Design a protein around this ligand. Structure first.
Ligand code: HEC
Ligand code: HEC
Length: 316
């Protein structure tokens, strides 16, 4: 098929294994430790929050409500991106000044380990529990003092890399299964490519590789995507893979409807104008991007000890 051939020139299917990030070779011990930490709520000062709290791996890998905390964030509330397939994105979620990218931006996997809690607090918490020390020793053989903030970050990054979702219908199509998509979805695929959405949403995650001075604004009829004043603020073109599971949408999380998310992105300025039927065809296509959520065995964490820093009280 020429459609299949074109699709393969613009996109790629999720591979069986994730790409190695910054030389972080995955091992069973690192991944297991990273998983424990991903679900570990005692890294937060309140002891009520863990990565899974905002990136629920059972519900889209993201958060349902905009938030102002996490990753040492000090500004207004913003939507949370999904951890699913984040490892394939070169650009990270961005909701701010283009001028700040140079010094503050990093890969998704690395941005994920930016924390609000201080390094000393975290290390002390982890060292207070014998089992964590053993897990760090298992993950970092040969290191005399394995429990460090950097090693913690490396183990979490190892686990983040495993959160990929292969075998979506679209990936099967890319790989040759012409029947993986029905006619309605194939029409959506052709339109996605013919209307220029691929200028910003392409590659392995259909987005996630570049920043653009175009973002959602609250004026289908209630929202729109427009250029920011003086291109001062930029946003990362959203990776659309698994979009079916990641509502709400955009940097603000103001849109819950997938059809509307598609509609506001069809504009004359961007050269992506669409009529109502085409919007619906593209929606059909985007629904074929849902892959297999990885199976996760909930980790059994170790009990706190006398040396484990205690939860910090509620005082806003
Ligand atoms: C809610 C209070 C959060 C907690 C706890 C954690 N994360 Fe998060 N994360 C959150 C938001 C609102 C954002 C957009 C953020 C800016 O601050 O970066 C993110 C982003 C990420 C990413 C980037 C994904 C991408 O750009 O494709 C990753 C991979 C990520 N978060 C991972 C992660 C991990 C491993 C966490 C525990 C150490 C964690 N986050 C906590 C909100 C929240
Ligand atoms: C670059 C100039 C783009 C073109 C052309 C298209 N999109 Fe886009 N899209 C772009 C950005 C920078 C963003 C993030 C905006 C923000 O305010 O956060 C998006 C976002 C979307 C979404 C929401 C995805 C999500 O939140 O998970 C969808 C559904 C989407 N874009 C679809 C889409 C379609 C169908 C397009 C062709 C008509 C299209 N986009 C073009 C940037 C760009």
């Amino acid at each position: 098929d020429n459609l299949m051939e074109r699709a393969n020139s613009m996109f790629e299917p999720i591979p069986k294994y994730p790409p190695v990030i910054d030389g972080n070779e995955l091992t069973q011990a690192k991944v297991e430790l990273g998983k424990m930490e991903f679900f570990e709520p005692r890294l937060s000062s309140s002891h009520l929050i863990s990565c899974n709290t905002c990136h629920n791996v059972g519900l889209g890998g993201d958060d349902e409500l905009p938030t102002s905390i996490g990753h040492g964030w000090q500004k207004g509330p913003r939507n949370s991106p999904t951890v699913f397939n984040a490892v394939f994105n070169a650009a990270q979620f961005w909701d701010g000044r283009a001028a700040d990218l140079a010094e503050q931006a990093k890969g998704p996997v690395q941005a994920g380990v930016e924390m609000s809690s201080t390094p000393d607090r975290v290390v002390a918490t982890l060292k207070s529990m014998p089992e964590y020390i053993e897990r760090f020793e298992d993950a970092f053989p040969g290191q005399e003092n394995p429990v460090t903030f950097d090693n913690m970050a490396v183990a979490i990054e190892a686990y983040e890399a495993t959160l990929i979702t292969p075998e979506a219908p679209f990936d099967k199509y890319l790989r040759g299964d012409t029947s993986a998509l029905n006619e309605s979805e194939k029409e959506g695929l052709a339109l996605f490519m013919d209307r220029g959405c691929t200028a910003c949403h392409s590659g392995v995650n259909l987005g996630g590789q570049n920043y653009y001075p175009f973002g959602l604004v609250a004026k289908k009829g209630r929202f729109s995507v427009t250029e920011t004043a003086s291109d001062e603020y930029v946003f990362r073109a959203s990776p659309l893979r698994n979009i079916e599971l990641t509502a709400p949408y955009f940097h603000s999380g103001a849109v819950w409807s997938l059809e509307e998310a598609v509609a506001v992105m069809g504009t004359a300025q961007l050269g992506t104008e669409l009529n109502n039927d085409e919007v619906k065809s593209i929606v059909a296509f985007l629904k074929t991007l849902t892959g297999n959520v990885p199976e996760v065995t909930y980790p059994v964490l170790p009990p706190s000890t006398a040396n484990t820093p205690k939860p910090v009280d509620m005082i806003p």
